[PDB]
């Protein structure tokens, strides 16, 4: 409709022409245009950002791992390399590798002088590539272990009952399969607890986010009726209303969800959905309060941009963005003196057991 | 590997692409043909020729095809496009040369 | 009986309102910055463990019961 | 001689139109092109920046003559602000601010995603005004430090006599006047040691 703004194009062309000359290094116009794209994207809203040919693979990994690895997690503390624990369902675990194993040489490269990122990059690689590691256990004779990289699924949900009838569930980062994993975890909990459990506590603390679809799927796994979360955006296609299906394995068990400052995008979606329906009790500190549903639009040359396509709303219409969902209990981390170690979880368990004994018993 | 964009050419091509996006294909086509004449570059000339073909224009299409062929005689696609365009125009001797070039390569 | 000693964090995670150019909330309400918190007087619930437990239990019961 | 990378410009135009289409808020392409220029300059060279017309007018003259400054001089590193140097005899110097300190947040605001010029401008403030910073040293635990803004006086050079023929002259900062002051200061030393210094 309106004519194109020639002044803006003119100033942009002038700036590019002057920068490609005055600068103190040879700059290929490709580089200038690519940086211009990154500028037009990253400066609009903090979350939105262009993705290069490499970082797109990183985002795909973060959403759903399905990556070639040995299933070994190495942590660098005090400048020392050590293994917290072998990852379950990996060739390394079947190879006899146990927590605390100290690798003295990585493919002939000593672990000394190697940063955590370098070690992670060396360990990770395409599936099927052989890797040889010289490891010394308990100061014994060094032994060489040969492994083949294979596609390994990273755990998304973990649980551990603090007492019969009371269960604790944890979600690290939402993934595509997170909904199925949550359903499986609930089924296993029911099986091991004879199908009846007094209470369940949820842990979204420091859970950044992930795919909105899986978050809504988990909300459906817990909630039974009502509208979970719906999004509004400038473009009509971005709009989408999600409702919880009547299918429900939770069996209306009492539920307390922890929301820490970390929980930002998907954890907050689950928390808002549960709280708005009066279906669970939220405790912890004020959440990140970011509201944004982004689509990674595909593009040529493998570099797909990521834009804040739309915002979401809690079922009641409250907008989480820039505000956050204030927890009801408002339990801040502290030390209590007269599991038990985790004060927040101890409070959650005590409240849940009290609320279970007061009624329905 | 890649040539440097001149300021005026950069601005003209940028506005041409934006106009083509906004459906105002007339400005885009005019800017593309003018800049192809100014720059005598293979890629720009080919893009202008394709835009002209989509718009259905002929004289601009003929000029763009001739410019592309002269700038990129090596490409067989340019030879075929110029041959068809100038056979429509009415001149065949250069079309005959283009057909000979095609025969040198693996073409009809 | 027990006493709960509230602890402070030197570095606090920046909220979405802190990031430069944060989008406005859909509802249009006032934003929530990361202002420092210092209660002029400590609330009784924070002092004695039993009172805190009872207050939290009341809050949970009222919330879940749906009034 | 070489082809013009027109595909790059086509990709840029595609990205611009797609962004203006799918973005939540109506954004005029003026804003998109301004942000393209800004980010291009910022990514290419951490120090550089596109100064707007109003900013350029503000760049010509300082807002206030008595305007105060914290005193820390910073320089972007790996996209993260870095404290190059705490100028001596300033409130920031009194605190534990040392070279190599990484500033995470200023005034309770993250600075990771902003330009060095904007961060420096935010650091500056009215004289005698409180301010807060978050500092990280050698990958340590980020800790908060509060400072009081004040007008900074360099004092130029500092001179003293250490031994009968050994003198010590420190240059806190290189302002306009120091260019000559040193010599004057040197003269004094040359006067107080019989014209010769060991």
Numbering used by the authors:
A (entry chain E): 38 to 375, 414 to 436
B (entry chain G): 44 to 151
C (entry chain B): 370 to 436
D (entry chain F): 38 to 235
Authors' account:
To address this question, we further refined the class IV EM map in which all three LbcA molecules are on the front side of the CtpA hexamer, which enabled the application of the C3 symmetry to improve the map quality and resolution. We improved the map to an overall resolution of 3.9 Å. We found that the movements of the PDZ domain, the core domain, and the NDR of the active CtpA in the LbcA-bound CtpA hexamer are comparable to those observed in the locally refined LbcA–CtpA dimer complex. However, the threefold symmetric complex structure reveals that the CDR helix H8 (aa 419–433) of the active CtpA shifts up by one helical turn, in response to the large changes in the upper region. These changes help maintain the trimer-of-dimers configuration of the CtpA complex bound to three LbcA. We found that the long loop (aa 376–411) that is disordered in the CtpA-alone hexamer structure becomes ordered in the LbcA–CtpA complex structure, and we now call it the trans-interacting loop (TIL). In the back view of the complex structure, the TIL loop from the inactive CtpA’ of the lower left CtpA dimer projects upward and inserts into a space in the top CtpA dimer between the PDZ of the inactive CtpA’ and the core domain of the active CtpA. Analysis of the structural features of TIL showed that the TIL Glu-385’ and Asn-394’ hydrogen bond with the active site His-84 and Gln-360, respectively. In addition to the polar interactions, the TIL residues Phe-383’ and Leu-388’ form a hydrophobic cluster with Phe-325 of the activated CtpA and Pro-147 of the inactive PDZ. As the TIL is specific for CtpA and is ordered only in the CtpA hexamer bound to three LbcA, it is likely that the loop’s function is primarily related to the active CtpA hexamer.
